[PDB]
């Protein structure tokens, strides 16, 4: 389906705006290794976009780890707290966000991350995160499940003033679960996947790019870059 114009943008955070997926990978690989299991791309593809407890349970079931989801979340979060503040902005993120703000294009953030995790990750990028119209987190009372449930994107769109039709919203995602949540919400979606993700998991989005740097806003009826 050819790209159609949009008026409101919704961004994922982890792996899309910030380089935090490699932080999760290292902590989960370290935990999995002690059980002689490999935290591989196949497993990672299943859990990006899930809430922390959801992700933990999947890791445990798929890799048959001898722990509870609460135990895996506690241990992993304890380790991640030391590195999350070092999160860096992904290529193209700043350019795109500043462009939208300048042309008055509303945009918002919809992340399955909880409050503390979000605070840590964005603690050193406050000027970037202040430009978003609003933020929905995974611990929001309105979000019952992580992506691919559309809850989080629907909640996000309904909080713009005035609220757009879902079909005029464009999601940006790095994860398959997030592309599926956007489609389930009735929204178009730009995917910027890691190249290690499978072909099957990277061929569902409206547009698939190697980098945010390659996004051409005019394809979606937005102002071109000056
Ligand atoms: O490798 C991983 N990446 C991401 C998550 C989860 O998804 C959210 C962001 O992708 C994050 O909050 C965590 O629950 C995970 O558990 N493991
Ligand atoms: Mg993501």
Curated annotation (Swiss-Prot):
Write out the catalytic residues in the record.
12, 14
Q: Name one GO biological process term.
A: nucleotide metabolic process
Q: Which GO terms describe its molecular function?
A: metal ion binding; phosphatase activity; pseudouridine 5'-phosphatase activity
User: Which SUPFAM superfamilies does this entry report, sorted A to Z?
Assistant: HAD-like (SSF56784)
**Highest lineage ranks of the organism?**
Eukaryota, Metazoa, Chordata, Craniata, Vertebrata
What is this protein's function? Dephosphorylates pseudouridine 5'-phosphate, a potential intermediate in rRNA degradation. Pseudouridine is then excreted intact in urine.
**Enzyme Commission number, as recorded:** 3.1.3.96
Provide the induction entry: Inhibited by low concentrations of calcium.
Q: Which residues bind Mg(2+)?
A: 12, 14
Q: Which residues cross the membrane?
A: none
Q: Which gene encodes it?
A: PUDP
Q: Could you identify this protein by its name?
A: Pseudouridine-5'-phosphatase
- Cofactor(s) in the UniProt record: Mg(2+)
Q: Which UniProt keywords apply?
A: Hydrolase, Magnesium, Metal-binding, Nucleotide metabolism
- Taken from the record, one Pfam family name reads HAD_2
Q: Which family does it belong to?
A: Belongs to the HAD-like hydrolase superfamily. CbbY/CbbZ/Gph/YieH family.
A single Gene Ontology CC annotation of this entry is: cytosol
């Amino acid at each position: 389906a050819p790209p159609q114009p949009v008026t409101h943008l919704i961004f994922d955070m982890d792996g899309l705006l910030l380089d935090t997926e490699r932080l999760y990978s290292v902590v989960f690989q370290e935990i999995c290794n002690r059980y002689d299991k490999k935290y591989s791309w196949d497993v990672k593809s299943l859990v990006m976009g899930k809430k922390a407890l959801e992700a933990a349970q999947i890791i445990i079931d798929v890799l048959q780890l001898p722990m509870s989801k609460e135990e895996l979340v506690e241990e992993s979060q304890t380790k991640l707290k030391e590195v999350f503040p070092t999160a860096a902005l992904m290529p193209g993120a700043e350019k795109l966000i500043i462009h939208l703000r300048k042309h008055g294009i509303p945009f918002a953030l919809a992340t399955s991350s909880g409050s503390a995790s979000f605070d840590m990750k964005t603690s050193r990028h406050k000027e970037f995160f202040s430009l978003f119209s609003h933020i929905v987190l995974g611990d929001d009372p309105e979000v019952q499940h992580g992506k691919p449930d559309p809850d989080i994107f629907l909640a996000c769109a309904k909080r713009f003033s005035p609220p757009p039709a879902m079909e005029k919203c464009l999601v940006f995602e790095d994860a398959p679960n997030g592309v599926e949540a956007a489609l389930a919400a009735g929204m178009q979606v730009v995917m910027v996947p890691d190249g290690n993700l499978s072909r099957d998991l990277t061929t569902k989005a409206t547009l698939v790019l190697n980098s945010l740097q390659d996004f051409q806003p005019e394809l979606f009826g937005l102002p071109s870059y000056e």
